[PDB]
Copies of this chain bind each other. A is one copy, B any other.
Amino acid sequence: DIMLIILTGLPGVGKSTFSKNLAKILSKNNIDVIVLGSDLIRESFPVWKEKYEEFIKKSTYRLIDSALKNYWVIVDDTNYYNSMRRDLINIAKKYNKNYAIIYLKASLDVLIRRNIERGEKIPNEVIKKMYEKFDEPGKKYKWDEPFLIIDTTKDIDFNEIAKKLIEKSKEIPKFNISDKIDKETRKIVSEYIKSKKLDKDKIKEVVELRKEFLKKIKKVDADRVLKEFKDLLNSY
């Protein structure tokens, strides 16, 4: 009756816009749905610090868990790693609810241009690295395969998507430190870039710096690693 909807897709792809549109159609069909995402909590702090991400994450999972007892939930978050998608499916699993992964995609050119339009809050170079490195959902686990893959440069038919999701809802549900280090070093890089307003060339060197640093680290303690990373950017 209640379902968990898990969005996944890169920054600028249109997750927030899609969530809002999908929620409006669902509510028009008398479904009680809430849209929840990490940016809810993250943007409630006046500044970003790496040490906030743990509270942001858990607070987000908590609200989803609480919500999914009474309401459909649409999870509006990049969900860049399969371990994130697994953590969310485990919430549905806990309350025996169905779930549907909706993967939104657009070409890199489109994502960059949308980024430029939004005032390049994330550096273009970082979205480009994200796009190159993204493992498309379902590439490894059957439980990770999307219910819908949606091309956000093409027409999207919300009624159809609502219809399919509400059908799915009546079906029977059947069913990492490296990800942390990868994710937080990328966020630190982005903060540094925006904070120090780095020129294009410097942006490139810092993205490369991170790459080389992750090559070394792979060949660990998450905090020690991220602390060394900040120290590295400062030195550099």
Q: Is the CB of B70 within 8 A of A55?
A: yes
User: Closest Cβ of chain B: how far from A125's Cβ, in Å?
Assistant: 27
A119 within 8 A of B: no
Q: Is the CB of B27 within 8 A of A46?
A: yes
Complex interface residues of chain A between 6 and 52 (CB less than 8 A to chain B): 20, 23-24, 26-27, 32-36, 40-41, 44-47, 49, 51-52
Residues of B with C-beta under 8 A to A176: none
A188 within 8 A of B: no
Q: Is the CB of B62 within 8 A of A46?
A: no
Q: Complex: how many Å from CA A65 to CA B157?
A: 41
Residues in chain A within 8 A of chain B (CB atoms):
20, 23-24, 26-27, 32-36, 40-41, 44-47, 49, 51-52, 55, 58-59, 62-63, 66-67, 70-71
Q: Complex: how many Å from CA A52 to CA B63?
A: 14
- Contacts A32-B45, A63-B63 supplied; 11 other A-B pairs, CB < 8 Å: A23-B46, A24-B46, A32-B49, A32-B51, A33-B45, A33-B46, A34-B41, A34-B44, A35-B45, A55-B67, A58-B66
